[PDB]
Design an enzyme around this catalytic site. Structure first.
Site, PDB file in Angstrom:
ATOM      1  CG  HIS B  43      -0.260   0.309   2.217  1.00  0.00           C
ATOM      2  ND1 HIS B  43       0.238  -0.846   3.300  1.00  0.00           N
ATOM      3  CD2 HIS B  43       0.043   1.221   3.274  1.00  0.00           C
ATOM      4  CE1 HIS B  43       0.499  -0.444   4.383  1.00  0.00           C
ATOM      5  NE2 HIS B  43       0.463   1.007   4.403  1.00  0.00           N
ATOM      6  CG  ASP B  99      -0.058  -3.818   2.937  1.00  0.00           C
ATOM      7  OD1 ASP B  99       0.372  -3.305   1.971  1.00  0.00           O
ATOM      8  OD2 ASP B  99      -0.479  -3.142   3.976  1.00  0.00           O
ATOM      9  CB  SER B 197       3.087   1.978   6.095  1.00  0.00           C
ATOM     10  OG  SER B 197       1.940   2.787   6.816  1.00  0.00           O
TER      11      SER B 197
HETATM   12  C1  LIG Z   1      -7.544  -1.280   6.896  1.00  0.00           C
HETATM   13  C2  LIG Z   1      -7.370   0.228   6.728  1.00  0.00           C
HETATM   14  C3  LIG Z   1      -8.298   0.845   5.834  1.00  0.00           C
HETATM   15  C4  LIG Z   1      -7.115   1.063   8.119  1.00  0.00           C
HETATM   16  C5  LIG Z   1      -6.589   2.442   8.260  1.00  0.00           C
HETATM   17  C6  LIG Z   1      -5.041   2.172   7.550  1.00  0.00           C
HETATM   18  O1  LIG Z   1      -4.516   1.849   8.809  1.00  0.00           O
HETATM   19  N1  LIG Z   1      -4.538   2.066   6.526  1.00  0.00           N
HETATM   20  C7  LIG Z   1      -5.148   2.229   5.280  1.00  0.00           C
HETATM   21  C8  LIG Z   1      -4.394   3.083   4.382  1.00  0.00           C
HETATM   22  C9  LIG Z   1      -3.035   2.167   4.885  1.00  0.00           C
HETATM   23  C10 LIG Z   1      -3.334   1.672   6.347  1.00  0.00           C
HETATM   24  C11 LIG Z   1      -2.286   2.534   7.252  1.00  0.00           C
HETATM   25  O2  LIG Z   1      -2.459   3.692   7.655  1.00  0.00           O
HETATM   26  N2  LIG Z   1      -0.828   1.897   7.591  1.00  0.00           N
HETATM   27  C12 LIG Z   1      -0.044   2.484   8.583  1.00  0.00           C
HETATM   28  C13 LIG Z   1      -0.399   1.824   9.981  1.00  0.00           C
HETATM   29  C14 LIG Z   1      -0.903   2.714  10.896  1.00  0.00           C
HETATM   30  C15 LIG Z   1      -0.983   2.294  12.112  1.00  0.00           C
HETATM   31  C16 LIG Z   1      -0.468   1.160  12.508  1.00  0.00           C
HETATM   32  C17 LIG Z   1       0.289   0.371  11.663  1.00  0.00           C
HETATM   33 CL1  LIG Z   1       0.758  -1.237  12.175  1.00  0.00          CL
HETATM   34  C18 LIG Z   1       0.339   0.828  10.091  1.00  0.00           C
END
Ligand SMILES: CC(C)CCC(=O)N1CCC[C@H]1C(=O)NCc1cccc(Cl)c1
Ligand code: NA
Ligand code: NA
Lengths: 9, 250, 26
Positions: B43, B99, B197
């Site tokens: 992503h 992912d 991420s």
């Molecule tokens: C299932 C998704 C729609 C929930 C929001 C979300 O966290 N997303 C949607 C876009 C990509 C990802 C992200 O922000 N990843 C970064 C992240 C944030 C917090 C904790 C982790 Cl482990 C990773």
């Protein structure tokens, strides 16, 4: 916010 | 990273930074698994819901970094991508299933005290180490609260039981995932956050004392909220595709 | 081959300030 990477890259 | 602390120099020599050329900025975390391959979260490159679709030319890879903003002269290395490889059944539509992504570098990066690859787990290590309560470690340059540190942050996090993981969210969780973090009761907290991420979730094997990359930083609902957990891509499950991609495109 | 072994730690038998936390969780 970031320091500029060298131009060359 | 939320509730973490500054990395020590050389603590995470596999840590990579997915960098934007224009406009220059942190884009995602990533890992060195070879002198030519960087592993990351799908992503980070491709997420249509937010009009994210990056191509090779669009990005820079910076290895050996401690500082988030500074260019680290004589220490860090920045590389050009030769090709991006995204998992063919990456579920960006629903739950971010599979992912994961591989980025082949244009030239092999030179290993150093600040640059060195991490291992990828085998079935046995994986079987042995991925266990509820077993602690892993994640690293990243992401926000420090649901923000923006000067140096690489580090936090150790316990793997969490699958039913808890599932009971904590409305999202359909899969076997290509695991979640991590402390419960609200356990006192300690901490978590990945925005900008982390693609970063690596590592564990150190007590069998050979090497660091294995068990997970990729995938998703969370908020950062470090109680009752919520970090969700990580299960690297061992998607390993075949990883070998397959390497064992043919280099 | 020589993966997972950090130059400034494992290769010198130095260990970082919190790895034991992981070892103890196992
Ligand atoms: C299932 C998704 C729609 C929930 C929001 C979300 O966290 N997303 C949607 C876009 C990509 C990802 C992200 O922000 N990843 C970064 C992240 C944030 C917090 C904790 C982790 Cl482990 C990773
Ligand atoms: Na649920
Ligand atoms: Na949480």
């Amino acid at each position: 916010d970031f320091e500029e990477i060298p131009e060359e890259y | 990273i939320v509730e973490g602390s500054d990395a020590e120099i050389g603590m995470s020599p596999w840590q990579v930074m997915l960098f934007r050329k224009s406009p220059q900025e942190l884009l995602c975390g990533a890992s060195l698994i070879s002198d030519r391959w960087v592993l990351t979260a799908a992503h980070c490159l491709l997420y249509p819901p937010w009009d994210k679709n990056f191509t090779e030319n669009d990005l820079l890879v910076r290895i050996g970094k401690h500082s988030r903003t500074r260019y680290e002269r004589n220490i860090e290395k920045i590389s050009m991508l030769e090709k991006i490889y995204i998992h063919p059944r990456y579920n960006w539509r629903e739950n971010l299933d599979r992912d994961i992504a591989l980025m082949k570098l244009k030239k092999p990066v030179a290993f150093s005290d600040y640059i060195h690859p991490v291992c990828l787990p085998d079935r046995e290590t994986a079987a042995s180490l991925l266990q509820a309560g077993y602690k892993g470690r994640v690293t990243g340059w992401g926000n420090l609260k649901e923000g923006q540190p000067s140096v690489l942050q580090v936090v150790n996090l316990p793997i969490v039981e699958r039913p808890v993981c599932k009971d904590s969210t409305r999202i359909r969780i899969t076997d290509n995932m695991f979640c991590a973090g402390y419960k609200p009761d356990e006192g300690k907290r901490g978590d990945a956050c925005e900008g982390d991420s693609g970063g690596p979730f590592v564990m150190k094997s007590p069998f050979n004392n090497r660091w294995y990359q068990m997970g990729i930083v995938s998703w969370g609902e908020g950062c470090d909220r109680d009752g919520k957990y970090g969700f990580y891509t299960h690297v061992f499950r998607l390993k075949k595709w990883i070998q397959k991609v390497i064992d043919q495109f280099g | 081959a020589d993966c997972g072994l950090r130059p400034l730690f494992e290769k010198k038998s130095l260990e970082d300030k919190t790895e034991r936390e992981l070892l103890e969780s196992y």
